[model samples]
Target chain A: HHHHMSVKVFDTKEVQDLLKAASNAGAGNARTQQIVHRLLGDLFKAIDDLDITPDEVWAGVNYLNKLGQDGEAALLAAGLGLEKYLDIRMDAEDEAIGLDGGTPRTIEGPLYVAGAPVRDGVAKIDLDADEGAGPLVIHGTVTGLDGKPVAGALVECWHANSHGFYSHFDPTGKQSDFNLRGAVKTGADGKYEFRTLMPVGYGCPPQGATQQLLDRLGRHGNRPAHVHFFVTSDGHRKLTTQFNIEGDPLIWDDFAYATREELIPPVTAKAGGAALGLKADAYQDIEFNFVLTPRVEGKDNQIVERLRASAT
Target chain B: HHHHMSVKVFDTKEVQDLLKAASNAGAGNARTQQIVHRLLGDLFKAIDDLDITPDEVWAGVNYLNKLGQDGEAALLAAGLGLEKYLDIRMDAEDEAIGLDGGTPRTIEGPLYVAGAPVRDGVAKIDLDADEGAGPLVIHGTVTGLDGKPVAGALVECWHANSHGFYSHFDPTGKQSDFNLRGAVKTGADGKYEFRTLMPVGYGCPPQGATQQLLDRLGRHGNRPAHVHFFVTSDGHRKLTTQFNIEGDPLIWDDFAYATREELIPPVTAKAGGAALGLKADAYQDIEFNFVLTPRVEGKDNQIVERLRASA
Candidate 1:
């Protein structure tokens, strides 16, 4: 096993000269310089250190290209735990600066789309005539870390359908645009209520770019049945969190690492469904209070920015 | 410069724990898990070691998407020196395994098209009235490592036209199909001669994916005037190489790293240009000898298989 690895060329002057030529060819962006220099350095180092064959490296290059073309690069990132790591890494950063308050922020894995139809207080998060939908009656309160109501907060919410499909990204054309996504706006009471389809869990599509990697890794690509929220209020840190419906088999085994013990609220039989547009029976009730830390001087990017586009 | 790099989590448990799950912690295909762990580990380590920000990582991802979409991955591999490095690495492997001898292999840049016109011994490699074409009377002898003729060899040859445009790839429709390319089959003497237009150099297109990267690097992407060949004979290793026309300015500064001191041969005035289609007056001659090492055991891929399609 140990006989495979060898390193010689990468340490030599001629090879180093090639890398220097690649990264420092005349001049350009210094950040570009540093980044390219380090990137090529490590790339070649891996190629040499692992005794990687040329064919294997070629395959690696092609794999990336395939990931991009399949548009599952973010999915690959999630299943590979990179997204979750970024969340934890930032949480550490938050802890370092006395952000020891508010709800735990989680990864918003590559599925959010801007301009989700917005409405005040109450909204249905799925298409009409979507009968037999879980009709989960959900509501949330936005509060400051000091336990004060954060009025006019907007809870941008999105989740998958019963078949684990998110709107705007479902391959099966069963649902139209914005089928199971919406944003609820809080009024002066700092509270918002919305009804949604039961948060069905999502898994890497069968043989998809993400699922295949997961399959090969002996891992099943799945996230616990849950809902995503980007809670935003003026003058407060944006909080990204997920609410896992209790009793989900994958709640403890979420593939994307989005399952937080604190985020899994209890789900039980409920009453008073009529006002929220739910049937008289079988509607589950879920409530979560999202606490936002007041924006500190440098740490106030309440809504953490990620790669996003509107309907592209 | 040192202040720009502070690696924190590469060695941390939190970072490695992600690797554990992503690597398929326990289950099928341990080999897959190992390779993924190693590859992903190095990738993440590179990011952490360089303090590559999220924006930079995103840019890298997008860069790859563009590369694949543009189909310049093979080109980028050449320009970034990966292909050349692979050549060197393979050469090292050959030496380590005691198979060193004969011509050094060069990076076959992403420009070889299959199904060139074939001829018996002598061939005219360019379209007619490639007029005023320097009509380079080129010839080469394929020999074994023992200095004996390796007859019945196929010398697949190709080069760019005077305008630096290859036949099939010329975007301007200036050249017809297979215009400056052909395959020469050597008979008993192991010698093949061909007449071709003066070899021309090529460069990255204006604002191409490759050109854009080259632009950022303060580098001009250009290769020296040269022609490519693959010399193949039964029971012998295929030789992939290029013959650099002497006196080209970029011969030594080639952006593709294809210039080998040994591969560049001098050109001079020549005679005997008649029978092979060149007019006598100012024609030039260039010659090279390609030596092949006998394919030993598993190394007997007289024709190395890469992604190629016949047109």
Candidate 2:
């Protein structure tokens, strides 16, 4: 006789129940508790809706593991626009809170390494310049939301070399740890300036996980020429943003999708540049200003501080 | 003066758009395309709706990577019941197709290894038993969906030793590659028999990632003492199921939730049996019959065949 005692193996409602259980599983310093619930709930629903099989799920889990083990997790985020998307979301929240009209923050791409030597007002950011590379100067003022100068504001700046490589990442022995990366403090008028060669646009890894994914997407991985900044003051929200060099061919088509039309500074070329300590017959100058938003109480204005605040 | 743009950085409608873009981003054999779309779409919406910070997302990603690198991906699915849920889903589909009244399938657990020795009817499954292991004989008859004996059916059987450790994963050198695991063909009358030491319930790794997650879930990781089987014959569905030892403390409360009410068999105490060639006066005997469903064309009736076909 066939044995059948009516008991269903899976109940559809158990999917949501499982996620709810997992979300509340951890205790103490579960800073991501609510987010975990949301993520798991949506994730389970999508899997159910798509009818994803166990083998497919396992394959994805394996790939995600490889991504982290290879230490390319951060790189993948930038390439996939996760980093920029987060920034965009935050910008929306900030806008909703009436905390807009400052420099728009973009992703601080994975090339940044900390502990650069800080200086006041003006500092040279280039070392052992490439042959035939033109000199460029960038000057900026950091101001508060009320149009007042933030005198002691710290303006951290970094960019790639003419060969489209960062210092610490490129072990050519030509660029030191702090090459093309330095911090400048604002003077009495809240003005900060730096001198360096114009950066060149860079392509993603010729062949790697990031490039492999991009190639499959039928997309290019070349980012336009740009400089990164982290501007912070005592009573203002820290801004992590970058400026795309004007007149660059890839400016409007940045693979990173980080370009903002307003952040492009006007570049002026001079035939004889005796003013800004340039030996070249021609040099370029860019004048851009950073507007800082006042920090609200109980809110972390610094990027590192904000990240640390939720580490638990 | 401050520069302002009226356009928002993120639109509410971009959730679905981003998923579509990511799904189409990959090249050939991109089996993860639709799954990626589903995962990323849900993930993005969750992040946005919950206001998840960048740090939180990164942390979760890091944890997922570790889970995979540690080779605990399969373990995670089991603990989360994803594997079981999938089986249940398939079962529903099968039931809807009127492929019912078959032995209920359960998880193969992660301990199965291929290439066990094959034998004719009445093959012994255990060797060099440990002290106080208690002899056991499991005899069963294989029958088709029409309730008739199916001769030449292959009855594959495996179980842990008295110490609750399988062969390959057991590092104590107490078990060999094919210890307590074998496949026996059914003889006339569709009868098959196997001799083994009674298995014991095993606990999960105490401090591993699986255990950590289990602890978080407030769940114990101990499975009940059970014997696994895969019965197959020509024109009959290959059955993958396990029988929980009767009267076991963990049988009704298995941590894996794998125990089925109908799979438990009665254990009969026995004295020295001259007929079965048993030397001991103390032993146990279990007589059970496996009723399998007839193979339905175009349907996955066997786990191995299903996985292989999908592959």
Candidate 3:
């Protein structure tokens, strides 16, 4: 005998069933694929509970399409504070695990390009043709949690040019790949230094999806002048952080909201050409140090490696 | 005299402020804009309150990107029941307004293509060379809420062919734009009819984003055999609905979950289509009547036209 299977027309249960069915119809095994399944269910439940209309959902879909087509999908995380949320969660985890105090973490942003040229303790990051900026030297020591020097750590650094654009993304087509980007290995004294033009703060592309979203938020799309780094040493957890140019107007008001108290170091002006082994007559310098915590036996050591390891 | 200004890190207020900033970033000055703004705020609040992980949010963005890129974004509304929810809401509104009863509404699905060739009372939607399916006739009467005939009413209809593909979307290149789709004006008797092959049920694209999402939800993407319609008259409220084939197994089990009890009518086998004014030896026939309520003085009628007028 067969029984009629039916539901009250458009009942809550029926709507939920449709969402549940769609979630269960995909390729992955649900038991092994918990996150996507759970996320989809939760999202649908939230939408239903909130009684969001069809037109609103369609509008969101259109925005998402535009974001992906324009390659601005990654920027959304920072703009929405998802990136900062992740950073806060990671910091809490480190504290709970008793990881030693170190430099505060910040977002890597979407501009980092992997595989820069590795160099000795000192690498010149600015090209001779680099203009519109002044000379600056950044020297740092990489140390372990217990305050002992950690030599041979790779200091990978990159930053925007004077025009506020990275080499590859720059429309000028003047700078070659890896311009303003390089990796230096720490020397016996756990010291690393790089010479490059002081990077400048830049605004988000006008009329772009990111900028449009920022405009709606009643906020500017400008980031403060800063430089990025990813330092990794064997037997220590990788550090992904950045240093803001002290006194930049947008430092505390970073659009990405990634700036922290300890991440901005003071810049000092002095008669140069000898202290940091630079040739410029008057150059700026920053002495910022990075401390790394010892890596647990089974943990990932670098930011990129950690993300890749947890991606599945 | 510069002073430091900072909020507590990761505080709920800070997180919400960021989301609020993102939502307020665009340009829109229309009344309809409020709903989207409110929805965005609600969605962000939900995400933050749930403490959804960054990876999960990124994953969702990726899926939405894929869905839009594949042009399957519209399908999501149906699969997730938003389309049906809207229909149900409209029905309730009609009830509240004391509009007369009519056919139960269902989703328009995503396949409607405007400007189908208009015909007289009778329309032949099937090509002469149409193969792979049996012939069927869907004849109906159009009337006002008072049960009086509605002459000159436009009865627009469309359906998937035997292969379960709409005309323009069919990759075989055999069907033209208006194939298996047409608009017929009712005659003096308010009668309308269409002759075509029986439409077939079909599944969503295999391994497509929609299919994959459905699989993850443990749901099938199959829909039942059905035909869509939109009827409009000068003095009547527009009617948008569909008739599901009575015996189709997926009728009540539509993946879109759009099937409703009042929308299905029984089919009858006939010897010689004399009653339908056809010379065929044998054919199937379905008699469906469309009842439209009188258009209110100021309110818009059909969903599409209403949306356009409001927009």
Candidate 4:
């Protein structure tokens, strides 16, 4: 024993037994056991292999606590590229299963709130008319790959306000719930439309938990102005996508990695006229369409299960 | 590309760049950069190496969120053996620095509430009388490893009530604040005493977040009936130890991995009347002593910094 002073931690049976009992402790669900076992095994091995100090572990744990209390777990997932990574995996799955074409699926950033106002063919997503913000209208059609117009499709849409804040999440408490968020049902003509104030690029909360880690990683947390959509039909595959407004500096440099080439449509303008009966005649326009694959039998064709916010 | 069905996730420059930016994103503190770099490096590598699915990643992230919101991060640390592992590292540190042979240190177990009522030598830790619980008195002296009584040391103590609940944390909201918890300053002769009810072994909240993980791990979240102490004097190394009450079924089977053989004292009884001004006068007695190591110059001989709750 005098020959050396270092204790072999991983070599010791006690350490081995501790890990054994930690991961194999209960008769649990198979995936639960596999996930927990693999995670802890890799983590503990990393601790030994990386010499992760106690202080670091505590810091990580405490950071997680703060992140959760801030309700930024989902946001952090997207910011850390796990959302994009999962999208990549899903794309691969789609290719393997021959679920090709349609609009390219993209990352679903974590600002979605369900149960927005629903109206056939049209919905006013913005609650107030901001004098300084530019008026904009986004109209789209839901179609299948065969160029067939898909009527009765629910085009769920949401976006940041002029200040880059989502309803129900603006810490300023100024915006009303469901503001700049709504769902437009396709009419018999297979068209959907929403009028709203143009959204600006947004950043993570100035000093919030998500930004804290991003700052430490030397990464910025800006996302270009974009509109989110969850287009669903009774017989077609659910399409979760976003349309990035062109000309934002971070359009392709979105920190969330959600921007795609096809998703960014050109922003155009129209002369003042009473076409949609708006107080402001002149407004910006973004016209983009969504394509959804037909849901085939014997495949997991629905949207995957995940935790999403729903309003009463 | 036609020959390949599998995408080279890690082999892609994009992924390598992602990790590079993830760990090297900030010019922060040197240690912070290194620690973050190493952790994310290992974790991302593990994902690729172990084929950790996207679902698994989300599950882990969500679990962390739940763990944090429950304020059981510290508790999970102990249950996962990280606290004990740190103690081991500190033990090695103490050994290398020639500071040894005092009472053994154990895991602090994440439940110390500070700013208790300080008294000289004696304090009533229990607030109300329990008709069914046994009366107990724990008296001990704080001394150094050289067998010299260290007077004027503070003997900070706390334990659960008969119902296995700590004050300020009793979810039932029945126990008074600081009930069965106090700090006693040693007398001129280095003696400390406190009267309290016998503490029963406690389990984690039945369906709480801590018990959730412990249940899934097949481990019971139970600890032996014990009293926690933090003994500190001016020129002595602070001692943090717990005395497990003997006769508990889990005396040696603590879920927190905090039990030590020497820390468990035998439970005896004394039959008395009128000497200590009590009516019934038969009570259980627990006499345990603590030994401290003298602080040496030019050596780190203080309690390690950790997050502890203060009332």
The DockQ values of the predictions, listed in order, are 0.45, 0.23, 0.21, 0.38
DockQ of 1: 0.45
Which digits, one per residue and each the tens of the lDDT, describe model 2 over residues B1-311? 13333333334565344445545533433645555555655666666655566766666655655565565556666666666556666677568767768778777666666676668888776766667477888997888767889999988888888778887666467566678788888887999998777888877667666666566556677878999898878768778889999988988666666777888989999876446655466789999898888765634433442221000
Alpha carbon RMSD to native, model 4: 4.2
* Model 1 misplaced stretches (Cα beyond 4 Å): A1-7, A128-132, A205-207, A272-274, A279-281, A298-306, B1-7, B25-28, B115-118, B127-134, B162-179, B205-208, B269-274, B278-284, B301-306
* lDDT preference between candidates 2 and 3, better one: 3
Between candidates 1 and 4, the one scoring higher on TM-score is 1
Off by over 4 Å in 4: A1-8, A49-52, A95-100, A174-177, A187-189, A294-296, B1-8, B45-60, B95-100, B187-189, B277-280, B294-298
RMSD of 1: 3.5
lDDT of each: 0.75, 0.70, 0.71, 0.76
lDDT of 4 by residue, B198-229 (tens): 88887888866778987776678888999989
Per-candidate chain B TM: 0.90, 0.86, 0.88, 0.91
Order the numbered candidates by lDDT, best leading: 4, 1, 3, 2
**lDDT string, candidate 3, B40-136, tens digits:** 5554544444454455566665566567567665676677665666676566556666774876667877777777677899998876345767888
**Candidate 2 chain B worst ten-residue window by lDDT:** B302-311
True contacts kept of each: 0.37, 0.25, 0.22, 0.30
Q: Which TM-score value belongs to model 4?
A: 0.89
TM accuracy, model 1 = 0.89
- For B1-311, candidate 1 gives per-residue lDDT tens digits of 12432436768886788787778654768866877887778777776666665556656655665666665667777888887887777777678776668887887777788887668877887774455357787887888888888778888888887777777777667566667777888888888887877977887776567777777777778998898887777778878888888998898888888788888887888766675566555688888888888887735522344554355
Q: Give the C-alpha miss distance for residue B145 in model 2, angstroms.
A: 1.9
Cα RMSD, model 2:
6.8
Interface RMSD after interface superposition, each candidate: 2.6, 4.7, 5.6, 2.7
Interface RMSD of 1: 2.6
Model 3, B268: alpha-carbon shift in Å? 3.8
